[PDB]
Design a protein around this ligand. Structure first.
Ligand code: U2P
Ligand code: U2P
Lengths: 124, 124
C-alpha cells in the first residue's frame, strides 16, 4: 500500500512547478491521460477542436498512412493541436515532455461503424 | 476492453479554447495526481514550497486538527499554495475545478517516524 507520506506528496506537493506555466501542459496531460505508465509514450498529440470536428475528418481527404494501411484521412483545415514530445532529459518514471502549440492539418486513422478516429497518425 | 474510439478520445482529445491556461492547472493536476477516480475530490491544496519546508512544519506550531485529532501543525510562515475546488458545474466523470493561487499558513497532520506530513488539514 502507498505510504501516508507518499500519499501526501502525491496529493499535496508540487515544489517543481506552478499554475502560471504553459510549458507543463504535456507533463500533466500525459500523466492525466495515462500515457506515462510502464514507459513514457514518446510522442502524443492532443487536439483542441470539438470532438465533432475531429470525427468529421474520417469523411474528409483519403491520404497515405505512415504505416501503409489505407484507413487514414487528412483534415480539410488546420486544427489547434498540442504536440507532446518526450525530451532528451526525460527518464521513466519522471516523464518529461516539450509542449508545442501547433496549428496544422491532422491525419487520423479511422475504424468502426460509424468510422471514427482510432489512431493519430501525423500532422502535416 | 477499452474501445478504440474511447482510447483515441482519452489519448488525443482535449477540446477547448485555452488548454494550457493557468486556470486549467487544477483540472490537470487533480486528474494526474489521481484525485478524480470514482468521484471528484471536492477540495485539494497543492503546496509550491520545498518539501524540506513542508516537512519542517511537523516541528512548528501545534494546532488541533479540524477532526479533533491532535497531531496537526501550523506553518510558522505563509506558503505559496494552490487551492483546487470543484465548481458548481462539476459532475463526475467530468470533474471541474477552480484554481486559486494564494499565500497562507498551512495546517498538516504529521505521522510516522520520521514524523512527516500525512494529511493536509487546512489553510489559514
Ligand atoms: O504527430 C503525432 C505522431 C504520432 N503520434 C502517436 O504516436 C504513434 C506512433 O507514431 C501514433 O500512432 C500516435 O499514437 P496512437 O494514436 O496510435 O495512440 C501522435 O500522437 N502524434
Ligand atoms: O487539501 C485540502 C483538503 C482539505 N482542506 C480543508 O478541509 C476541509 C475538509 O475537506 C476543506 O473544505 C478545506 O477547508 P476550507 O478551505 O474549505 O475552509 C484543505 O484546505 N486542503
Amino acid at each position: 500500500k502507498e505510504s501516508a507520506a507518499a500519499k501526501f506528496e502525491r496529493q499535496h506537493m508540487d515544489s517543481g512547478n506552478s499554475p502560471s506555466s504553459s510549458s507543463n501542459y504535456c507533463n500533466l496531460m500525459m500523466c492525466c491521460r495515462k500515457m506515462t505508465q510502464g514507459k513514457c509514450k514518446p510522442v502524443n498529440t492532443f487536439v483542441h477542436e470539438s470532438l465533432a470536428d475531429v470525427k468529421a475528418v474520417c469523411s474528409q481527404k483519403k491520404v497515405t498512412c505512415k504505416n501503409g494501411q489505407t484507413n487514414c484521412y487528412q483534415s480539410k483545415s488546420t486544427m489547434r493541436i498540442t504536440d507532446c514530445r518526450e525530451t532528451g532529459s526525460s527518464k521513466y518514471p519522471n516523464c518529461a515532455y516539450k509542449t508545442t502549440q501547433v496549428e496544422k492539418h491532422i491525419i487520423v486513422a479511422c475504424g468502426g461503424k460509424p468510422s471514427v478516429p482510432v489512431h493519430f497518425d501525423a500532422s502535416v
